[PDB]
Every structure is written in structure tokens, then in C-alpha cells.
Amino acid sequence: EWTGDNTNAYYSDEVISELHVGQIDTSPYFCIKTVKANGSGIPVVACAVSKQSIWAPSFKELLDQARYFYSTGQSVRIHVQKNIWTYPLFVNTFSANALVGLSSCSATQCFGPK
Amino acid sequence: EWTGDNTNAYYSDEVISELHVGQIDTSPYFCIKTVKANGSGIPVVACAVSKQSIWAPSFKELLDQARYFYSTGQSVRIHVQKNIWTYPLFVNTFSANALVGLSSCSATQCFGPK
Amino acid sequence: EWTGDNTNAYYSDEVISELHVGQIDTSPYFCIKTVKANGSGIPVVACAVSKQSIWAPSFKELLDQARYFYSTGQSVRIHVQKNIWTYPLFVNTFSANALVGLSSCSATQCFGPKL
Amino acid sequence: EWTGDNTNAYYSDEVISELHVGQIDTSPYFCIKTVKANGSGIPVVACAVSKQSIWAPSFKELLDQARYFYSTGQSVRIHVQKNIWTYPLFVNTFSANALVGLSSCSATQCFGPK
Amino acid sequence: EWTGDNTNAYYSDEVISELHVGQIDTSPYFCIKTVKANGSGIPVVACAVSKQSIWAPSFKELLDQARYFYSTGQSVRIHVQKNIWTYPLFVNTFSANALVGLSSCSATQCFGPK
Ligand SMILES: CC(=O)N[C@@H]1[C@@H](O)[C@H](O[C@@H]2O[C@H](CO)[C@H](O)[C@H](O[C@]3(C(=O)O)C[C@H](O)[C@@H](NC(C)=O)[C@H]([C@H](O)[C@H](O)CO)O3)[C@H]2O)[C@@H](CO)O[C@H]1O
Numbered sequence: 103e104w105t106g107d108n109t110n111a112y113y114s115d116e117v118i119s120e121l122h123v124g125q126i127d128t129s130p131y132f133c134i135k136t137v138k139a140n141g142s143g144i145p146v147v148a149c150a151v152s153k154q155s156i157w158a159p160s161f162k163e164l165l166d167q168a169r170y171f172y173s174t175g176q177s178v179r180i181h182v183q184k185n186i187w188t189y190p191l192f193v194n195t196f197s198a199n200a201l202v203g204l205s206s207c208s209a210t211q212c213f214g215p216k
Numbered sequence: 217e218w219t220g221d222n223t224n225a226y227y228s229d230e231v232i233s234e235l236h237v238g239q240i241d242t243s244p245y246f247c248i249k250t251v252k253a254n255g256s257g258i259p260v261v262a263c264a265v266s267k268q269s270i271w272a273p274s275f276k277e278l279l280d281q282a283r284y285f286y287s288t289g290q291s292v293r294i295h296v297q298k299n300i301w302t303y304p305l306f307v308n309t310f311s312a313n314a315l316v317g318l319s320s321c322s323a324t325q326c327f328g329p330k
Numbered sequence: 331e332w333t334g335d336n337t338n339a340y341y342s343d344e345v346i347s348e349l350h351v352g353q354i355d356t357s358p359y360f361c362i363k364t365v366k367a368n369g370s371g372i373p374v375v376a377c378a379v380s381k382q383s384i385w386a387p388s389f390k391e392l393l394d395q396a397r398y399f400y401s402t403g404q405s406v407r408i409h410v411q412k413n414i415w416t417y418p419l420f421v422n423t424f425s426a427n428a429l430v431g432l433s434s435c436s437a438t439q440c441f442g443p444k445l
Numbered sequence: 446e447w448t449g450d451n452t453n454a455y456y457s458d459e460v461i462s463e464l465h466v467g468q469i470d471t472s473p474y475f476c477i478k479t480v481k482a483n484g485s486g487i488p489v490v491a492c493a494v495s496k497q498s499i500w501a502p503s504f505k506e507l508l509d510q511a512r513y514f515y516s517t518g519q520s521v522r523i524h525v526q527k528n529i530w531t532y533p534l535f536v537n538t539f540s541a542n543a544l545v546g547l548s549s550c551s552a553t554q555c556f557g558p559k
Numbered sequence: 560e561w562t563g564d565n566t567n568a569y570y571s572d573e574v575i576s577e578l579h580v581g582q583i584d585t586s587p588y589f590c591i592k593t594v595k596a597n598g599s600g601i602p603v604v605a606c607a608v609s610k611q612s613i614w615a616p617s618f619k620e621l622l623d624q625a626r627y628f629y630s631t632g633q634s635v636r637i638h639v640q641k642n643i644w645t646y647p648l649f650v651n652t653f654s655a656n657a658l659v660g661l662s663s664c665s666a667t668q669c670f671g672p673k
Pocket residue numbers: 111112113114115138142143144
């Protein structure tokens with residue numbers, strides 16, 4: 103598996119605008135929300151769950167990087183894999199997207215797979 | 217179990233006004249005080265105890281995130297489980313609430329379960 | 331044991347003015363110096379030593395919190411247990427106080443145990 | 446082995462301009478892009494992959510340090526070992542370079558091996 | 560052994576002016592250069608190596624603390640033990656000093672052993 107696989111999805115020129123942390127089924131987790139820097143479109147919601155999904159190993163790295171980008175407000179590309187989380191109240195609160203990568207963007211390009 | 221279970225309680229549009237770290241019965245713990253951003257109402261007090269309860273795996277994640285929202289003074293929703301801690305002077309000094317989650321509320325609604 | 335046991339000691343409305351990191355007898359340790367915000371009294375010194383004393387599990391947490399409070403310079407309540415470290419040159423330079431807790435304070439009250 | 450081995454390569458007076466985090470084959474990884482501080486030259490790209498290559502022990506240290514130098518935009522020397530990652534798509538997106546060290550540079554000199 | 564031992568050396572009112580991180584013989588390491596805050600004297604260079612010397616257990620604490628004092632530019636007392644590192648090319652790039660302590664200072668008074 104790889105962040106860059108074309109079976110994942112991504113959204114460029116987004117800014118992390120909200121951040122949540124909690125626990126589910128003994129697993130710490132966090133979710134983020136991103137919105138287009140230019141105000142268009144609809145928000146992206148993704149979560150990482152510390153001991154769930156193939157993406158479990160990068161939980162801490164993605165949490166630290168999400169916090170960094172959240173506090174700077176900079177434009178990023180968010181990479182997710184859709185339809186991973188299944189608990190209905192959780193999905194309805196947040197989404198089913200697993201968070202699989204974050205890429206800083208310049209005004210012209212984003213530094214990550216495309 | 218989940219931060220968002222309806223057996224837990226939450227308070228929206230709060231700010232983290234105080235933070236304390238200590239140790240009890242060989243376990244690191246922290247507690248936070250929150251108050252409504254607009255000044256109304258009464259404070260909320262909650263603690264996490266590193267080695268205790270089903271919420272123990274989330275101790276570090278919650279301490280890190282509590283420190284961040286405390287340093288910004290931004291609006292948050294705090295999620296708690298009532299009536300778990302037992303040592304009477306600890307309960308009386310702080311509370312029996314376990315901290316089970318923290319959501320940012322930078323928008324109309326808080327980014328978390330309700 | 332508990333940070334708030336009345337056999338421990340505490341000092342309210344203190345500013346963490348200095349911070350030191352070193353190693354003693356295989357253990358990383360740190361010490362802080364604190365002074366009353368209002369300028370009165372004498373400094374308090376206290377140290378935490380990794381894997382030594384009953385307070386060892388809280389070492390990393392205390393160091394991170396002490397760093398944060400040092401960087402802001404805000405008024406805090408410092409909680410210690412007296413007469414813990416016995417290395418005589420170490421005590422002479424710093425003290426025998428084990429750091430056991432740190433509480434933020436508003437101008438009117440500190441968020442931590444008293445008595 | 447050593448960062449400073451002459452079989453490694455290094456580029457002086459660079460700025461870390463972009464940062465990416467993701468996961469590959471169970472390994473969280475990060476990549477950085479750097480450019481000459483004066484605006485000349487061609488970018489350098491390098492990645493560190495957790496639990497992969499002889500450089501795995503230093504993964505967290507290099508991630509923390511690259512985050513710091515990325516946040517200050519200060520001039521640095523980046524040290525790499527070439528032709529380490531073999532996944533062709535990954536190499537094509539990023540580089541085959543393993544990141545092996547980072548040195549601050551003054552106006553006069555870089556504080557590291559040459 | 561103690562940071563404050565007779566047989567160690569120290570240099571007061573110094574500013575961390577450079578920082579480097581790398582790896583050697585499977586061990587991550589970092590080095591710092593310091594200069595007198597008032598501009599006098601000759602630089603000091605010291606390194607810490609995670610799996611080596613009797614000071615190995617304090618590697619992470621000293622790295623974190625060096626980073627913090629580096630980022631603020633404030634005046635410190637640096638404590639070293641001479642003649643520790645042995646790989647000649649390493650000593651030639653940096654020095655043989657093992658880093659063994661950091662003490663903050665104020666107006667020509669440092670909080671550490673003298
Ligand atoms: C920017 C915007 O909201 N709307 C359109 C825009 O769709 C369109 O071109 C876009 O230009 C941006 C600049 O980086 C991107 O290149 C868009 O491609 C991607 C993206 O990177 O965001 C690629 C990606 O595969 C898509 N993801 C999915 C699941 O389909 C996303 C996604 O559709 C959007 O990001 C969601 O808003 O788009 C690229 O489409 C230009 C017309 O050229 O006009 C803007 O206003």
C-alpha cells in the first residue's frame with residue numbers, strides 16, 4: 103500500500119480548519135476537517151485510528167503533521183482512502199475517510215503524488 | 217466505548233483556562249479547567265490518569281491536545297465521562313470526570329459528536 | 331502517594347526563572363529555579379530524576395510542563411517532596427527537593443491542591 | 446556508516462521549501478524538497494522511511510529536525526545517500542535519495558561534514 | 560558520573576549558533592556549536608551520540624533541550640566531557656567533546672554546577 107496509490111483520493115489547496123481527538127474501542131483517534139483556501143467546494147473530513155486499518159502505523163506521524171499544518175494554516179493536499187470507517191454514528195459525525203497523507207503546496211504545485 | 221457515546225457528557229464553546237500535572241498511585245495524570253468563552257455558567261473540571269480506566273491509551277494524545285488548546289485559548293467542546301475517579305481529596309480538589317475528548321469549535325458548530 | 335498529600339510542600343504564584351538539564355548516576359535529570367512573582371521571599375529549587383524516586387513515572391510529563399511554563403513565564407504553583415535526593419554535591423548545587431507537580435494560577439487562585 | 450562518508454552526497458545553502466508525509470509498505474515516511482537560498486539551481490528531493498534502509502534508526506530525529514528547519518526557512522546543507530529506494534513509482538514521484546543528515550549553514554560555512 | 564563533576568568542563572554565557580543531526584554506526588547523533596554571547600572567545604563544539612558513551616541515557620533530553628535553547632538564542636552554560644569521541648574524521652568535522660549538560664543563564668549567572 104502507498105499514500106500515492108490511485109485507489110486513494112486527494113484534494114489540493116486545502117487548509118486544515120478543525121481538529122478533534124478522542125478514543126473508540128480502546129484506540130486513540132483524531133479527525134481533521136479541511137476547506138478550500140479559496141472558499142469553494144465542500145469540506146473534506148478524514149480520521150486516523152491508532153490501531154485500525156492498514157494505515158495504523160502512521161497514526162502518530164500524521165497526527166503531528168496535521169497539528170503542524172493546522173497551526174500554520176498553510177495550503178496542503180490531503181490524501182485519503184474512502185469508505186474505511188464503519189461505525190455509523192462515527193461516520194455521521196465525521197466521515198468514513200481514512201487519512202493517508204498530507205502534502206504542503208506552493209501557490210503553483212503540491213509536493214506529493216497526483 | 218467512544219468519546220461520542222451518549223453515556224458521556226459534553227460542553228460546547230468552552231476555553232481551557234487552567235492546566236495541572238501531577239502523579240497519583242504511581243500514575244502520571246493531568247487535569248484541566250474550562251469555562252464558557254462568553255463568561256456564562258460554571259467551570260468544567262476533568263482529569264486523565266495515565267494508567268487507569270478504559271481511556272488510558274489516549275492519555276498522551278489528550279495531554280498534548282489539552283496543552284495546545286490551552287496555549288491558544290481557542291473555543292472547544294470538552295467531552296467527559298462523569299463519576300469515575302475515586303480518591304476523595306483528588307475528587308474534591310479536581311473532580312471525578314475523566315477527560316475523554318476535545319473538539320475545536322472555530323465555526324458555527326463544534327467539530328465533534330453531540 | 332499523591333502530588334497533593336499534605337506531607338508534600340507547595341509554593342504559590344511562582345515564576346520558573348531557570349531550567350537545567352544534565353545526567354546523574356545513569357539518569358537524565360532536570361532542575362528548575364522558581365521565584366515569587368511579586369519579588370518577595372527566597373528561590374525554590376526542585377529536580378526530577380528519570381527512574382529514581384517514587385516520582386519517576388512522571389519525569390517526562392513534568393519536564394515538558396516545566397519547559398512550557400518556563401517559556402511563558404506565567405505564575406504557577408510548584409509542588410515538591412522535600413529531602414529526596416541525597417547525592418551531596420548534587421544537593422549543594424541544586425536541592426534535595428523532588429518536583430511532584432505544577433499547577434497554573436490565575437491572579438486570584440491556583441488550579442491545584444492546597445492545605 | 447556515517448552521514449559524513451564521502452560516498453554520500455550533500456548540497457549546501459539550501460532551504461527546505463516543501464514537506465510531505467505518508468505511508469508505504471507499512472512504513473510511515475516523509476519527503477522534503479529543498480532549493481538554493483539564492484534561487485538558483487535545481488531542487489533536491491530526499492525521503493526517510495521508518496524501519497527501512499540502514500538509516501532507519503534516525504527516522505524520528507530527521508523528521509523532527511526537518512520540521513524545524515522547514516518552519517524557519519533557514520539555510521541548510523542536506524546530506525543524502527543516492528539510489529536507496531527501489532519502488533519505481535515512488536522514486537518517480539519523489540526520489541531514490543535517502544536523507545542522512547541536516548546541518549545549519551551560516552553566511553560563511555555549514556556546520557557539518559563536507 | 561554527574562554533569563557537574565570536576566573532570567568535566569563548562570563554558571558560560573554561550574549562544575547555540577549551529578545545530579547538526581545525523582547517524583553514525585547505527586546510532587543517531589547531533590552536534591551543536593556555541594559562541595560567547597558578547598562576541599568574544601573561540602567557538603565550542605559538542606556532540607551527543609544516542610548509543611555511545613556513559614552519557615547515552617540523556618541523548619533525547621539533551622537534543623530536545625539543545626533545540627529549545629537554539630530556537631530562542633538565549634544565553635546558556637554548556638557542559639562537556641573532553642576527549643570522548645574517537646572516529647578521526649568525525650572529530651575533525653566536529654570535536655571529541657561529549658555534551659553532558661545545558662544550563663540557562665541570566666545576567667552573568669547560570670543555573671547549574673560551577
Ligand atoms: C479548485 C476548485 O475547488 N474547483 C475548480 C477546479 O476543480 C478546477 O481544476 C482544479 O485545479 C486544482 C488546482 O490544484 C486541482 O488541480 C484540481 O484537481 C484535484 C485537486 O488536486 O484538488 C484532483 C483530484 O483528483 C480531485 N479529487 C477527487 C476525489 O476527485 C480534486 C477534487 O475533485 C477537487 O479538489 C474537489 O474540489 O481536484 C483541479 O480539478 C478548475 C478548472 O480548471 O477550476 C476550479 O475552480
